[PDB]
Structures are given as structure tokens and as C-alpha cells.
Amino acid sequence: MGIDELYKKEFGIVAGVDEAGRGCLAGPVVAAAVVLEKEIEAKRERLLDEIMEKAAVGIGIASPEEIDLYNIFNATKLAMNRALENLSVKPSFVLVDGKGIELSVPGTCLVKGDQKSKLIGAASIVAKVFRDRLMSEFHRMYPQFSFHKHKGYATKEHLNEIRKNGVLPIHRLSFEPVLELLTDDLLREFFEKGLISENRFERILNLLGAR
Ligand SMILES: [Cl-]
Ligand SMILES: [Mg+2]
């Protein structure tokens, strides 16, 4: 909509920040931070290629473990800050998709920022394309799960897969739909095998015990 134009001149280097995967049942939250010089007008992958040519980009991830330990809001912020740390240029100001998120660099959050700002639009594209590739990797690791299709979102098929095959360490064990399927025995298996940390094990065992 052109909101970036307001921030072009008084705010030093400005980056746009967005995420992919906040709403998922499995996998990380992936954040992108983007500083664009040049003008930019699977249209996603078309745009990714132009972004790659015309922007400085940084990527930050927060794992299922971190989501389970810190909560989805803190984990998303952790990813976003990591994305800013990953940028080769240090921005002076950030435009962030959402509401009430305070990052390591001062900024402003825009509700539906991905429709209002080109910078944030560009960050949303990078984060989505890159997270989608990762989820396709996870279908290779866990072929009983169609992560390549649902991307770990709680679709009918994903839920059917969890019910039939069991929860995985890459599931967000603290989220009700997963937590309600998880057994004490499977959780102990994960810990026994070194598939989850002791901190994560204890956290989820508490959540399960209080049920
Ligand atoms: Cl873990
Ligand atoms: Mg967003």
C-alpha cells in the first residue's frame, strides 16, 4: 500500500520482518528480515529470485523445543531477533508484521503488515518459501507424514497421520491437539533415545501430569 515510503527518510536503514509457521502443529517458526534497495513489482518463487538479487536477507529459526519451553510468542520473537542478527547490514529500525512485538532493534508493528509494506511482504515470501523447503525435507525424514503438503499445519490429513503413526519430536508437544494424543511411554521413549532434551521432557511430563 506504500507504507514503506513514510520510513524512507528519517529512520536510517529499515528492515521488514515476518515469519512463517507460527500457526503450525509441527516444525520450527522461521523468520526473515529483509533490507531492499532496488524496486520490485509459484509467483512466490518468481519473487524470491528477485528478492535474492535486490535485497540483504537474514533468517532466524525457533525450534519445537523452544516453542514448548518458552511459548509460541516468545519463540516467534526469538526467531525474529535471530533473523536481524543474521542480516549482514544492521538495520536502525524495523517494520514488523503483527502487534506488540518488541525486537532488539526499535521499530513499529503493523497489523496485516504483509499487505501494507513491501519490506514486510518480501520477508513473508522468503520465510514461507524457505520453511516450505524445510517441511519437504521432513517428509523425506518421516515418510508416513505428508509435511510436503500440509507443512505441519493441523489439516485433517496431518491429524489422521498423528493419530495413526504417533507424535514425533518435531511436533509442538505443548499444543493441545498433540498433547492430548501423547502418552507418558512415548514421551519417555523420546528422552531415552536422546530425541528430546531433559528440559523439554520435564516440561511436557508436567503438562501431561496436570491432566
Ligand atoms: Cl528437544
Ligand atoms: Mg506474518
Swiss-Prot record:
* Annotated GO CC locations: cytoplasm; ribonuclease H2 complex
Q: Which UniProt keywords apply?
A: Cytoplasm, Endonuclease, Hydrolase, Manganese, Metal-binding, Nuclease
> Residues that bind a divalent metal cation, according to the entry?
D18, E19, D97
What top-level branch of life does the organism fall under? Bacteria
* Cellular location(s): Cytoplasm
Q: What does this protein do?
A: Endonuclease that specifically degrades the RNA of RNA-DNA hybrids.
Q: What is this protein called?
A: Ribonuclease HII
Species, as recorded:
Thermotoga maritima (strain ATCC 43589 / DSM 3109 / JCM 10099 / NBRC 100826 / MSB8)
The UniProt gene name for this protein comes to rnhB
